[model samples]
Target: KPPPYKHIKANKVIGKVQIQVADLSEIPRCNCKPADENPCGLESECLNRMLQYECHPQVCPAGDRCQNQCFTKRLYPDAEIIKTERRGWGLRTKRSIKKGEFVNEYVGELIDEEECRLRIKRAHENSVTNFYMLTVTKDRIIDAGPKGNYSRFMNHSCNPNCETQKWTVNGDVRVGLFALCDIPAGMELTFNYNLGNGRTECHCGADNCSGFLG
Candidate 1:
């Protein structure tokens, strides 16, 4: 039998809760002049946005009119889950996605490297092949095995249509999925696992398919 884990429908990371400080000085604040003609633009002028930091609504000079906050679940695109022939579960978007649109965040349980290794060994022992662990930082990892959003259902493709990007949301770094190109509606989403220029029996039938996952 395969291993068991509780399924989480929504993206909610469990563990120590991080409260946003009310003070502007404690977090990053942008220098966008609110008096400008096109002050609502985030991608064009906000340095913080350029640095991968979504401006805090309270800290941005543009205030509620700012366009830099796309990392939230509310703004996430509508993607659904479906069964695959070779792959188990995969994700597909209901609406067509732009090349640079923010898809979704990899929400799950926050864990350390040691805990990650332990879970890996446990899965290996049980002969479980579907992995959901993502290494976000040097010592930190987001273990989506037990507690995670549907983003965990995303499959790995050597020639993929989606990719992960490190975005600083509010004052914390959150990993998010982004479209590599204009994805048509109902297309399956995929990204490079980078499990290490590695082999895992890939079934992605792309022309440049490496035949293995990394």
Candidate 2:
């Protein structure tokens, strides 16, 4: 039988978007314990402060059910997709989100190193609008460009209220987005994309804008 939760799938696009649908079977189950056990040490708060105390493999207690289980088995329940003038499409919250809260897993196609390289080549060849590829492991890459959940709409911000965490679910790399601070309702969700040397303009409008994508 399928577990209580399944890996996230992309919403159907309106136009002729071409992206591979994720192979759910390829995505593994989360081996961590349920939130009731504080799998992420939410009670003791011994996790990384930069990640808002998210659970980590080294910092968290060791066990089959004690990985970085900061998030739940399901996706973000209070998130929505919206249009943004500066960033085009963005993800937003309908209610207040507290610090260290689990936002959602960045779900997408699980491809091998060769496939990742080919898709990246295709994207660059076609001049894709946004790059949705995330390097999760040396062999596995999560491509959310053509297919992804609402997390795909999330944009970058120099002064972001959220950050992505590299979590391990049953030893498989799972990238999770978490709240860095208290976020009020109606505020668009953001994280530092850290695009590396491939810099881009920053229009986050924050007073501390670094003037480029960090």
Candidate 3:
């Protein structure tokens, strides 16, 4: 049976389509050949992937042979949301994760700076503790606090087994959570809260704990 995700619901969408870039037809495509093995995706030197841009299916010659679509394809390992007595909430892996494995994507509302500021202010006013905001691009912020998937439940750690990476998916960018090392099953998934302001205390329990989370 698949594990279920349990969490509070909340990120209401605040979006925008800034600038001249419009329509999917204008996207770039990779002309890599499709092979039975050693496909032209991921580490295969796909020009788009090299540029940190995801391949567009319509224009990509590889078609279904593309392995660079980790986020778009939802190629994630089994995991579930669990409650942490000390940390509030966390994500747990049901299976072992090898190094550099793609865990999941941090999905949420696409809000601009003003909306992001508004949300921060409101959360501060309401005294909300858990924050799920992530700055993907200059004007794009992903706020998973309200509307999110299992990845949003991941807790912060001083020495984490997992880490986050910004990846371009199709036209927009996304935050992809990945395994930093080989991790055992049933272990809680965590990453350092790199965005600290000397407020939230660190309880990751690492030997080299920074004393406080940013």
lDDT of each: 0.75, 0.64, 0.74
lDDT of 3 by residue, 44-144 (tens): 76777777776666667777776667776776788987877777878899999988778988877768888888888888889877788888766778778
Write down the lDDT that model 3 would get. Answer: 0.74
Candidate 3 lands at a TM-score of 0.82
- Model 1 stretches astray by more than 4 angstroms: 1-23, 34-43, 196-198
Q: Give the clash total for candidate 3.
A: 5
- Which candidate comes out best when scored by lDDT? 1
| Candidate that scores best on TM-score | 1
Estimate TM-scores for all models: 0.85, 0.67, 0.82
Residue 143 in model 1: lDDT = 81
Clashes of each: 4, 1, 5
TM-score comparison, 1 vs 3, better candidate = 1
Tens digits of lDDT, candidate 2, 1-214: 2112233552222223333333444333333444536553445433333333334343343443453444434547487778777777788999898887788788777666777678767867887546776776566667776567778778889888899887544324467888899999988899987532355678899898888766
Q: For model 2, how many clashes?
A: 1
Rank list by TM-score: 1, 3, 2
